[PDB]
Amino acid sequence: QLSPTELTEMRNDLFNKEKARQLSLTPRTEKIEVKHVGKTDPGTVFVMNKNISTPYSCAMHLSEWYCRKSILALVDGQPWDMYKPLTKSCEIKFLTFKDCDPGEVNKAYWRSCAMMMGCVIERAFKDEYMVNLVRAPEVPVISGAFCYDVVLDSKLDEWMPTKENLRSFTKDAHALIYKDLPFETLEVEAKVALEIFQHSKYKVDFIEEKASQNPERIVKLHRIGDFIDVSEGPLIPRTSICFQYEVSAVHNLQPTQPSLIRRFQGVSLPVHLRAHFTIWDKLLERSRKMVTED
């Protein structure tokens, strides 16, 4: 079949080809009047470019405090990615971690960390072994840890990671955080995503169910570095947002006879909500316990 090093290359090429196509169909320069609605500096009007400007660009117009603090953008009441281009003139609101109700920010952060941790799964194992991800369960924040569903090769039926193996996963993630990859989003048609992930049966099922629930039958794909994943909901702008990272443990779902399901788990905390070493240690102990959705 196709080697993993070439699978990333073609998937990146398809992502670039789609991004160029979306820019090409867009006209040259159109002006959209984006009005700033918020408790700070109200009445400001941003005349930006459609499908080119981003809520981050509006943030740079005001000050770097918005750029550093605003984790999520609220467009017309629905969440919006920080680097997602605007499609029409509308009111804009920015959300931070230390807000009255940062529920969407926490959920966006929770899904963002799942992809980062999910990304290092493929690079962690040997080239001879095969790794195929299933999906990203929408585990609640209060559960104590975020989880990702992975399936491993038939050789590792009884293999369970040790402390060093989990340490290696953390080191790769910290390097991923260190590289500071921005989160890139793209809204695409379902058929386009299907040919991108034609080599993964689980991703194909995820794409078809996402299109089923979406009347427009379009899904959103997020890219980090050379990694592309099918995620639902907006994410944080960059990988530098998270400060403390760790993968707690690995659990095996049941039953395993039809298919072996490994539920990798981890916990993270951003820079704005940095915790003490003792407090973080207790969270690590809690995150090691297995968690299941309701």
């Binding site: 109700d101 920010v105 209060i142 104590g144 905390l269 915790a275």
Partner: protein
């Protein structure tokens, strides 16, 4: 060597120090909220705290009346202390005042502070508030509290 010295050397001497504190206390009684240098506010805070304790003793108590007579330069405030401030804090055993830091004054860049009696009719100060319970760190710690709570009861 200043070990255990709990009184600051302010003003022209011990007499002036008492007089300066007395004037600040009188303005705090009359206006219920004053701004003054940070060190002077901190020193005067103890005297303000103890005034209500003497006020709670009742106006008929001769010791409190003599203490209120000295510490209130304006005699009209004595009925206010014994009939407004003391009834307001009758259920409260301490912490009648709250002290906060304000930006330095432009005249001499001095450390400024504001002290006011709780329960005043003035508009509330922008008191600093702790983080909301809905944030990511609080939610994670709340989840740990619940799981720990369910572990001990079972």
């Amino acid at each position: 060597i200043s070990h255990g010295r709990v009184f600051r050397r302010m003003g022209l001497g011990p007499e002036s120090r008492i007089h300066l504190l007395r004037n600040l206390l009188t303005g705090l009684v009359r206006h219920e909220r004053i701004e003054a240098p940070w060190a002077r506010v901190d020193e005067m805070r103890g005297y303000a705290e103890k005034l209500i304790d003497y006020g709670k003793l009742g106006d008929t108590n001769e010791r409190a009346m003599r203490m209120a007579d000295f510490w209130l330069t304006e005699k009209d405030l004595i009925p206010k202390l014994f009939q407004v401030l003391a009834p307001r804090y009758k259920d409260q055993t301490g912490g009648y005042t709250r002290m906060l830091q304000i930006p330095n004054r432009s005249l001499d860049r001095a450390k400024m502070a504001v002290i006011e009696y709780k329960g005043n009719c003035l508009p509330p100060l922008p008191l600093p508030r702790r983080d909301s319970h809905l944030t990511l760190l609080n939610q994670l710690l709340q989840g740990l509290r619940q799981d720990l709570r369910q572990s001990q009861e079972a």
